[PDB]
Amino acid sequence: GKITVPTAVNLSPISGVPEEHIRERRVRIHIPPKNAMQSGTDNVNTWQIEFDNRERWENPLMGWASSGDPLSNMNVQFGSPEEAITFCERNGWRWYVDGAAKPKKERVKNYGINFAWNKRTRVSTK
Amino acid sequence: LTNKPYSFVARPWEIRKVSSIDVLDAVGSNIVVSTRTNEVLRILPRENEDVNEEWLADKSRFACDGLKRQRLVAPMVRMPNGELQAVEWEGALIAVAKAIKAAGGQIAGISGQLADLEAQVALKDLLNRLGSEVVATEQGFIAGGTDNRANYLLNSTIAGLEEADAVLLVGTNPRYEAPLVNTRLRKAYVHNELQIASIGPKIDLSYDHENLGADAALVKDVCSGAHAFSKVLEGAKKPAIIIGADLLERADGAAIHATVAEYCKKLKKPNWNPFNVLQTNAAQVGALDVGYKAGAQTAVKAQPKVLFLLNADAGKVTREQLPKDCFVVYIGSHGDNGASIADAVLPGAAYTEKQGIYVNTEGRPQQTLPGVSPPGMAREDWKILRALSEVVGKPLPYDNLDELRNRLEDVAPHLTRLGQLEPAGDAGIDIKLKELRDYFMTDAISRASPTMAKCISAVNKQQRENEAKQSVAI
Amino acid sequence: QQTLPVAEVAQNLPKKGYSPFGTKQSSVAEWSLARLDDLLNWGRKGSIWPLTFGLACCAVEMMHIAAPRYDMDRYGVVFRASPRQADVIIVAGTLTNKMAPALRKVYDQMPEPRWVISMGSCANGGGYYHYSYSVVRGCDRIIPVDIYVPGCPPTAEALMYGVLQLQKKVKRMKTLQMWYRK
Amino acid sequence: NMDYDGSMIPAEWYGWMHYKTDLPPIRDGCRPKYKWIADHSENLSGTKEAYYPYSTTPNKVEAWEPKA
Amino acid sequence: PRPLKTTNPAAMKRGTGGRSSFNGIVATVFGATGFVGRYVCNKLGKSGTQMILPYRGDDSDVIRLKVTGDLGQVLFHFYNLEDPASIRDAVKHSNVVINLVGRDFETKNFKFKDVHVNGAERIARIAREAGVERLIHLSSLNVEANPKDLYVKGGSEWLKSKYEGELRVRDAFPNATIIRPADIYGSEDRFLRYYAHIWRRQFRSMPLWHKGEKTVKQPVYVSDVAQAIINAAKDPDSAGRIYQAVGPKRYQLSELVDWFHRLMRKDQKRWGYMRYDMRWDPTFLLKAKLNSFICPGTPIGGLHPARIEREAVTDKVLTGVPTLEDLGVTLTTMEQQVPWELRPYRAALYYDTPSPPKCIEARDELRLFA
Amino acid sequence: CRGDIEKVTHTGQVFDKEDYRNARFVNAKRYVNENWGIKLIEEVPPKECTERVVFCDGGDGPLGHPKVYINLDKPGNHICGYCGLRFVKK
Amino acid sequence: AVQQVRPILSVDREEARKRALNLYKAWYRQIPYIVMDYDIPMTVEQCRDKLREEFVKHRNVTDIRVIDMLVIKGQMELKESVEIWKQKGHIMRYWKESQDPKPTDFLSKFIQGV
Ligand SMILES: NC(=O)C1=CN([C@@H]2O[C@H](COP(=O)(O)OP(=O)(O)OC[C@H]3O[C@@H](n4cnc5c(N)ncnc54)[C@H](OP(=O)(O)O)[C@@H]3O)[C@@H](O)[C@H]2O)C=CC1
Ligand code: SF4
Numbered sequence A: 001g002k003i004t005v006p007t008a009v010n011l012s013p014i015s016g017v018p019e020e021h022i023r024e025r026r027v028r029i030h031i032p033p034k035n036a037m038q039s040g041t042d043n044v045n046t047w048q049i050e051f052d053n054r055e056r057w058e059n060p061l062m063g064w065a066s067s068g069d070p071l072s073n074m075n076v077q078f079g080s081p082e083e084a085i086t087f088c089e090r091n092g093w094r095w096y097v098d099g100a101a102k103p104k105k106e107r108v109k110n111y112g113i114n115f116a117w118n119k120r121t122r123v124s125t126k
Numbered sequence B: 001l002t003n004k005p006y007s008f009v010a011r012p013w014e015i016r017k018v019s020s021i022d023v024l025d026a027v028g029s030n031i032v033v034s035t036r037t038n039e040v041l042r043i044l045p046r047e048n049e050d051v052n053e054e055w056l057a058d059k060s061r062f063a064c065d066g067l068k069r070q071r072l073v074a075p076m077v078r079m080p081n082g083e084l085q086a087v088e089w090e091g092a093l094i095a096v097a098k099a100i101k102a103a104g105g106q107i108a109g110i111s112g113q114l115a116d117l118e119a120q121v122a123l124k125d126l127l128n129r130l131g132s133e134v135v136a137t138e139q140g141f142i143a144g145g146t147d148n149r150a151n152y153l154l155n156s157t158i159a160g161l162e163e164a165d166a167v168l169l170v171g172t173n174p175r176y177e178a179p180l181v182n183t184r185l186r187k188a189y190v191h192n193e194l195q196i197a198s199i200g201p202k203i204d205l206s207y208d209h210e211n212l213g214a215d216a217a218l219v220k221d222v223c224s225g226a227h228a229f230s231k232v233l234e235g236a237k238k239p240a241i242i243i244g245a246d247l248l249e250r251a252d253g254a255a256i257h258a259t260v261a262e263y264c265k266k267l268k269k270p271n272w273n274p275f276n277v278l279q280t281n282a283a284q285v286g287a288l289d290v291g292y293k294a295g296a297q298t299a300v301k302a303q304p305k306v307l308f309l310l311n312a313d314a315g316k317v318t319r320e321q322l323p324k325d326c327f328v329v330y331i332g333s334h335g336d337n338g339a340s341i342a343d344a345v346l347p348g349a350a351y352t353e354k355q356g357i358y359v360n361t362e363g364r365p366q367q368t369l370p371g372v373s374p375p376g377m378a379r380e381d382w383k384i385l386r387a388l389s390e391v392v393g394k395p396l397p398y399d400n401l402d403e404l405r406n407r408l409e410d411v412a413p414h415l416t417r418l419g420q421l422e423p424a425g426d427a428g429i430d431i432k433l434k435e436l437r438d439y440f441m442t443d444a445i446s447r448a449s450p451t452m453a454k455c456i457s458a459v460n461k462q463q464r465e466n467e468a469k470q471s472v473a474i
Numbered sequence C: 001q002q003t004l005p006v007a008e009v010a011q012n013l014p015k016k017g018y019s020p021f022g023t024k025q026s027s028v029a030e031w032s033l034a035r036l037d038d039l040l041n042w043g044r045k046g047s048i049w050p051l052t053f054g055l056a057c058c059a060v061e062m063m064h065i066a067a068p069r070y071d072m073d074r075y076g077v078v079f080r081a082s083p084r085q086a087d088v089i090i091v092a093g094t095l096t097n098k099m100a101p102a103l104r105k106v107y108d109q110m111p112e113p114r115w116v117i118s119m120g121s122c123a124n125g126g127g128y129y130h131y132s133y134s135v136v137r138g139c140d141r142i143i144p145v146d147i148y149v150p151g152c153p154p155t156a157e158a159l160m161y162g163v164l165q166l167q168k169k170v171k172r173m174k175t176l177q178m179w180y181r182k
Numbered sequence D: 001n002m003d004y005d006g007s008m009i010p011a012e013w014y015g016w017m018h019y020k021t022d023l024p025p026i027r028d029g030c031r032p033k034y035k036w037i038a039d040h041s042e043n044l045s046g047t048k049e050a051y052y053p054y055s056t057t058p059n060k061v062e063a064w065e066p067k068a
Numbered sequence E: 001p002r003p004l005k006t007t008n009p010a011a012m013k014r015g016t017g018g019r020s021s022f023n024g025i026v027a028t029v030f031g032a033t034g035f036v037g038r039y040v041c042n043k044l045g046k047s048g049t050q051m052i053l054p055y056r057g058d059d060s061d062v063i064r065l066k067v068t069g070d071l072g073q074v075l076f077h078f079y080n081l082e083d084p085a086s087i088r089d090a091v092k093h094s095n096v097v098i099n100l101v102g103r104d105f106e107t108k109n110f111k112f113k114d115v116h117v118n119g120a121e122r123i124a125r126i127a128r129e130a131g132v133e134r135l136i137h138l139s140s141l142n143v144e145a146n147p148k149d150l151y152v153k154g155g156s157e158w159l160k161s162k163y164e165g166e167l168r169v170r171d172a173f174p175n176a177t178i179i180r181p182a183d184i185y186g187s188e189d190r191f192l193r194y195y196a197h198i199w200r201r202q203f204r205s206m207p208l209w210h211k212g213e214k215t216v217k218q219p220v221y222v223s224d225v226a227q228a229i230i231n232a233a234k235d236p237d238s239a240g241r242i243y244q245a246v247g248p249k250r251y252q253l254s255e256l257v258d259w260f261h262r263l264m265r266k267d268q269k270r271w272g273y274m275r276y277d278m279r280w281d282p283t284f285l286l287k288a289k290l291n292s293f294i295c296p297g298t299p300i301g302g303l304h305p306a307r308i309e310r311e312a313v314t315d316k317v318l319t320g321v322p323t324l325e326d327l328g329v330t331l332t333t334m335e336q337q338v339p340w341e342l343r344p345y346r347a348a349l350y351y352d353t354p355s356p357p358k359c360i361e362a363r364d365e366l367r368l369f370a
Numbered sequence F: 001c002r003g004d005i006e007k008v009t010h011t012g013q014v015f016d017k018e019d020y021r022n023a024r025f026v027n028a029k030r031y032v033n034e035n036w037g038i039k040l041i042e043e044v045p046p047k048e049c050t051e052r053v054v055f056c057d058g059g060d061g062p063l064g065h066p067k068v069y070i071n072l073d074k075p076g077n078h079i080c081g082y083c084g085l086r087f088v089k090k
Numbered sequence G: 001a002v003q004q005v006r007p008i009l010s011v012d013r014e015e016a017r018k019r020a021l022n023l024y025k026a027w028y029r030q031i032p033y034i035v036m037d038y039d040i041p042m043t044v045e046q047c048r049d050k051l052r053e054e055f056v057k058h059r060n061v062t063d064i065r066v067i068d069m070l071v072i073k074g075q076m077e078l079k080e081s082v083e084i085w086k087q088k089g090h091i092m093r094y095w096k097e098s099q100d101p102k103p104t105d106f107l108s109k110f111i112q113g114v
């Protein structure tokens, strides 16, 4: 007992997203930036989708920051960009990709170039 | 070692990290901005091997203190008393519309040092819809270089400049104009046997170089083949010639742009374009992409009744060059200079407060992202220009940013592929930046920052201390 | 603040008396209305009947003022199940989105004068489910609240301190003096 | 009279009345009795002298004054 | 080019428009505990306006207004109308002052001149001395310099008092917006509750002046006039402009009262509904005078003779003077809102949809008044 | 007049007279601490020491701040970053 | 671009449209009981206009499982409306009450900051 369907669906009516959030929100699919003061990269390999920043204002009473955007704190993790594309087209979001990952940076690290003859790669300290 | 402007301010888990680009230098370096609870905390490098390579200049990094001082929070209209007063948005828009209708099609507009690409497109569409065919930019350029892209691009890649074998600098100091290009040249200096010659005054590049002289016509000797560095340039595996934009703004200009281009047509390698130009303004490449007539004198000599300005604080235009009545509308974020002479000072958002495109010196378009909200009632500049076009009576067709990007596809297909560089074809003495204190306060955000003033005060204090200790021994 | 008075200073201070208004009224009609309002507020503070409105954990402490150690019954305070017979509603627990029209209808069917005690961080300010999808951010957005008892499960001395603060508010109610000055 | 509440007890006798310690301040010497210790105050809420919150940081964004 | 006052960037408009946002308005709604005050307080609190809210009586009559605004957007302040220092303390940090201070009957402490004439002029001059940018004051529709009596002797003191108070407000505060409501209907009002009360009727029969046929009234909803007050406070082109606050269609009083009794299921034949002339019945005026006498506070049902003369006076609009549709508010029609108001007021059905009322046009009104 | 509104705090904050946010203090007192930390840490004298490196505990062992070691080779007053006590070497 | 899935509550689009018409028929029959049994200001004609507006809002959908999901949620809301579990405030959530109508022009959004 199976039927025939297209593989591309639109789940925006059956979800709880109102029209004012499905019609004008841009989704950024991106790899999060590595913290430049750290040398680790275990939080970089996971792709994630996030939403565009909206208006955040000073509270009139206290000094807190108030925002009427419900989706400012929602980052959704994915293992590949194409699954994020499938998720964004399935939930009806308007998507864009910030940038693909760097494929390969071929680098060589030799200890002998620090102490070289007739070369300008010789170090002055140790 | 700790960030002293970012002394005791916040903590890493508290930080919202937003990926954007820096507009202070020419590199267009990818940055991550630390925003927490509607406040810019610090600016950190973002990883890209093609543009910045995990490094950041000091003007790029310590300009976050300038986003709090001398900001524009209210629209200001010059009263008949003589001083600007804070005026609500509808009154300011109908005042600019009344001055536009009183001008009668004799209007002009000048782009800025830190202006957005989309703001420049909105300004050009507003002026072209109002019967004005003249637009301008603060920093000048050669005549006829707008038609081909390779006239105004760093055509050799910043990632490729680390593979250079012999590079010639024609009247520029790259460590104070765009220092990450100087990091690439320093890497190519230490890793490859590179010989570098500079034409102009005595400058320090942080590595050794042969100073040919300050004479202009010596570069013709480099195009003659009789000079000793010309043999090194023709014998190089991957040679390059870099020309500063300030040398192209001078009256010789296009002539010095022509001859070395012919020299580039004498020395070319496959998958390598050796002609290079380094232009300090981040908005200059995008403005010349969308078709801006470069030079503020093109708008000065047109005698405009209403002179539009984007975020322009270079001060190349003043009240004396302008006529007796001139409704100067300044659409900027800080307005240290160029807003005191303006009659309708409109506010604006900075590069951390709005979403827009910037094109760097190599021609790679990149997109900044809004970190924090603009202070007061400041809006985005393209929204301001679209609302002004709706008040005037000839509205621009785009309503949101998506149709503005569609019009960007309509005017230039390579201005929307963000992060992707399309290589161009062939391209057909004093330096204003030679010291660190000259480097610190080039832009408006760096001028409004107290950190750069503290840096110049500390450097000058060390200079008088060293001069006193040297002169006490004499 | 003010420094609480030192006993050398406080021995020179006279006695406060029961009446917050004082017996120094000028007119005899104003004095008679002041004493009638004092008797009316004494009758109202002498027996407030809170309503059995226990939403969540805070209510487990609410029964602990029913308990023999704290003994709310010697303060005029005794629970009533019907909202008509009750003076006070003690919001003791977590007001949710499905709970909002029930609380509003129960408060509206209560007869006036109506004092409301917010018991616990879920009752005032939202608390530990303040960023939840189905929790009202405090009951102050729906029901007007006179006393706010602070602790997440308020100790029962602190809830009874809120009850005594409500009794001091009821004793400070000025109705007939306002009628004379209306 | 009749205006007493549970906040009239000072800080030094609060642990004695609440069975935290069994040492009164007339015998216990562990209390700090420093110079900057403020005197005790009752719950001032509901009066014309209660506490009302405010933002404690100064203004972050400094505007530009056309003058100067 | 309208200039800004203080250009403090912690005091400009921010946010989307909910409770937590701020629209740059600091309102001081005088008499906010009343019938129009509740609706204008909720309408101001739903947009993000901080209100100071000075109250005169007890705290229990004003503590219900804390649910309208967000945290810190609702304040309270004790004041007396005869005391000027408390009013100056109330309005010293405001830019919009809304004056709803009024009373339909004379009081032993405050007369009509002490509320409408002296009090509103005192509030207006204190707000002018305190640097308040805009003031909103409310009057009556049919204000005249010398309004004549129609049925009751001693009547129309309220209309003369409101006209003199409006003149003293425009003499004190020049840029003061004067909204003139005709007759405001809604829940907890003095129109539908006054025609809904047992004490208004007389043995299941309602007396009406000339059987209700002569007077033509154009009543307005309280949400419409609250939206008009907010639209006058936000838009600054409404400085010193009189706004006639009237409803969409004109109705005569007989058809209105018959439609009300059709809504309350009084049209059944066992109830014995009868409409008769008021001028033949002095017992009703004697009952109204005794009700104004024996009641210490407000009279029951609002059956003071000022309400009698107000229902005697027809609603007359002035040509060339703006209407609330120039303030950009869509007026709610009567037939949508009124059955919801009179749904709890319906009688029990006897053991043995209503027709909509007939509107009166201009030519039919001219034929009726001929 | 009330002197508790215009009084500055130790964070350098005061509501000016043109601010709308001083209307919240017309019925409630503005709470300003009169015991500033700057004067109360400038009031104590610096501690003179003879050894090159010292340790600051801030009081009792488990009840103080975590232990730090300050090097007093540089002339002047060296301030502990935890408690603010100043040490000096003769 | 074609996958075989398990059908939910339908096997063809005509059957799904027929069951949506069953849902609309039952909602249209339940309108005057909703107006009678709730203390709401909206009348019968306004309720029928709101029902037509919510159906033509979801007119645009095409997929069988999505339209069956919509029919299932509509029948659940209807079952919450026949048996009175929703309140007067839950019924009046379809009409966007207590909400200022946001402007669509660029000038009013530019003045208001939206
Ligand atoms: N049918 C109507 O509603 C019409 C009304 N108007 C006008 O609209 C305005 C508002 O009417 P509305 O709210 O319905 O009437 P209300 O009588 O119900 O409200 C008047 C408000 O003013 C306060 N108040 C009354 N007298 C004084 C006084 N002497 N000193 C201080 N405050 C006082 C009342 O406080 P408290 O809580 O103590 O009573 C109340 O908050 C009035 O100016 C009225 O003349 C005009 C035409 C028709
Ligand atoms: S405030 Fe604390 S104790 Fe009370 S209901 Fe909430 S979680 Fe429970």
Ligand SMILES: [Zn+2]
Pocket (backbone or CB within 6 Å): F056, F057, F058, F065, F080, F081, F082, F083, F084, F085
């Ligand atoms: Zn220490």
